[PDB]
Each structure stands twice: as structure tokens, then as C-alpha cells.
């Protein structure tokens, strides 16, 4: 008993969650977020859902994150889009889970 009727897992809202991260204060240098977000991102495209650069600007400037995070993603974003493919700098960090939890919630839609 939600009381909520039906609603609406919000999947590509929470592949949002993992770009924007639980610290969103980092520009330049980020860690593993630059590849792990690259190999979620990938993930997207994979199912055949090509993320648009301007819907990571968009939610960038209305989530608050740093631009020159933004404008990185935005050029992921880029190539994935256009069908080409980028290098991860590492694969170990794409963790089973991640993965997963955003199939299940498609999964569930």
C-alpha cells in the first residue's frame, strides 16, 4: 500500500544521481567518476538510449554542477550520440551493481 498510484521509477533521473555523484564539488580533477560515468553512460547507449549533450548541460545548470564537469560529459555525451566510442581508463570501477540498479529500474518500467 504505496497510496501513490503507479508512479514512475525514475531511471534515468538516478544515472544522473551516479554523473552528478554524492560529491558534486570537483572540476579538473576528478577520479573514477571520469571513467565510471563513462561505462554508465555507455551502458545507456548500449540499450539504445544516445544521452544528448544539452540534456547534461540542462540538468547541469539546474542541478548546480561545475562547468567544466558538464562540458566533459557534454563531449561523452558528444561522441556517444554520434555512435563513436571512448576510452575508459578504468574498467574495473563499472561495478556490477551500478548496472543493475538502473536495469532493474528499467526493467521495472
Same mark, same amino acid.
Given at each position: 500500500? @504505496?497510496?501513490?498510484?503507479? +508512479?514512475?521509477? =525514475?531511471?534515468?533521473? #538516478?544515472? %544522473?544521481?551516479?554523473? /552528478?555523484?554524492?560529491? =558534486? +564539488?570537483? +572540476?579538473?580533477?576528478? *577520479?573514477?567518476?571520469? *571513467?565510471?560515468? #563513462?561505462?554508465? %553512460?555507455? $551502458? %545507456?547507449?548500449?540499450? /539504445?538510449?544516445?544521452? &544528448? ?12 554542477? @561545475?562547468?567544466?564537469? =558538464? ?7 558528444? #561522441?556517444?550520440? +554520434? /555512435? @563513436?566510442?571512448? %576510452?575508459?581508463? @578504468?574498467?574495473? $570501477?563499472? &561495478? =556490477? ?5 538502473? #536495469? ?6
Amino acid at each position: 500500500v @504505496n497510496f501513490k498510484d503507479k +508512479s514512475m521509477p =525514475t531511471a534515468i533521473e #538516478k544515472a %544522473l544521481d551516479f554523473i /552528478g555523484g554524492m560529491n =558534486t +564539488s570537483a +572540476s579538473v580533477p576528478h *577520479s573514477m567518476d571520469e *571513467s565510471t560515468a #563513462k561505462g554508465i %553512460l555507455k $551502458y %545507456l547507449h548500449d540499450l /539504445g538510449v544516445p544521452v &544528448s549533450p544539452e540534456v547534461v548541460v540542462a540538468r547541469g545548470e539546474q542541478e548546480g554542477w @561545475n562547468p567544466e564537469f =558538464t562540458k566533459k560529459v557534454a563531449g561523452w555525451a558528444e #561522441k556517444v550520440a +554520434s /555512435g @563513436n566510442r571512448i %576510452l575508459i581508463k @578504468n574498467p574495473e $570501477y563499472f &561495478s =556490477t551493481y551500478m548496472q543493475e540498479q538502473l #536495469k532493474e529500474l528499467v526493467l521495472e518500467h
